[PDB]
Design a protein around this nucleic acid. Sequence first.
DNA 1: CCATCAAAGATCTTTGATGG
DNA 2: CCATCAAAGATCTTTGATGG
Lengths: 195, 192
Amino acid sequence: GPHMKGAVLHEKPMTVMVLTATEPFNYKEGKENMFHATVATESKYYRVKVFNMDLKEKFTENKFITISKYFNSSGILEINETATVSEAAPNQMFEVPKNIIRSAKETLKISKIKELDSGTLIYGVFAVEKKKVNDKSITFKIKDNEDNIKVVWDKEQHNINYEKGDKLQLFSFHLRKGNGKPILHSGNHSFIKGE
Amino acid sequence: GAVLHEKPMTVMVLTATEPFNYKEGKENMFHATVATESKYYRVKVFNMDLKEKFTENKFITISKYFNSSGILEINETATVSEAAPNQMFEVPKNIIRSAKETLKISKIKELDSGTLIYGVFAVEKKKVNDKSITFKIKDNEDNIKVVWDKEQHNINYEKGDKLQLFSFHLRKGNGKPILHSGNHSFIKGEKL
DNA sequence: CCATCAAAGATCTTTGATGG
DNA sequence: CCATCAAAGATCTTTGATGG
């Protein structure tokens, strides 16, 4: 089945414009690489997790593609081996509204992130106040104008590309509210990179 | 701070442990318990030349020793002699019994953080961690966690056994009282 | 009934208070 | 201005709730 549990299959074809995509990366040892992308329709942007590396080229910025038999997990799309992805016909193309492009690249305030439900996937670019390397984890204190929060990565550390002073790019991190002590924690598909 | 007592005191030796390594690069130490006519004292001995002197029921006269909040500490600068008969005496039965008794855990929990704790307790559970070994000990009223993080070698006691503790430190932090190993801590046990 | 992953809690490391 | 050492704080593990 889908890499995201509970994800629902959508057979109906949908045409999107690719806004951005990450390099592929190893998310789990012994498994094929994945990448993250953001795509948009005339009315909505979607975060997308792509598990078929045949599709690297099709996820080029500003390209229009038609996707079918993809999975939807709480608004996050998953494209795996069973999906069909083709280049869109010129007649299937459209203009993405500016507000949608803007929202797709925006990062929520940390204070607002903290109000979301536990388990919500968090994406964004944040200033780093401190980085701490431990044996079983790397932690970051990230911050903005108004607030700060801890980011916890407990996965393989070798391939993280982050340099002192960089802003931190987060993809698919999980909000954990704990009990008034919230953090962002890596999960199965999380990706982290300096900007 | 510990108080130096230059004047001689004659005591009877009640019990003493075998010597053990308490700190890397240091001479061994042992624990003992001794008594006068009127009081018992727990004792820490750091001069191993004195081990034969600390045999059960022996009367010894101690001088230039330290009293550290009720615990006597005997190092190289102390003088320890065999007592003269005229300094010998009878240790009353209630003093000997008090020397051997263990505080209820419910009373231990009320003491100040940092108080040194000794006693014999039933073991309820043992857990081995990466860098510590912990035990749950109990009596008829209460239970408490013991933490050993000094050497990470096997402590071969488990549920049903009895654990004898020497100079463990009470920590109350977080409203969660524990007994924690410290500089001079030692564990003996009775296998089941 | 395993797998998941967040909440709860234990363990481990750092800080800070105290004294000599 | 070392040495202790317990609390605070951070990391790490265990537990418990959910869902295919």
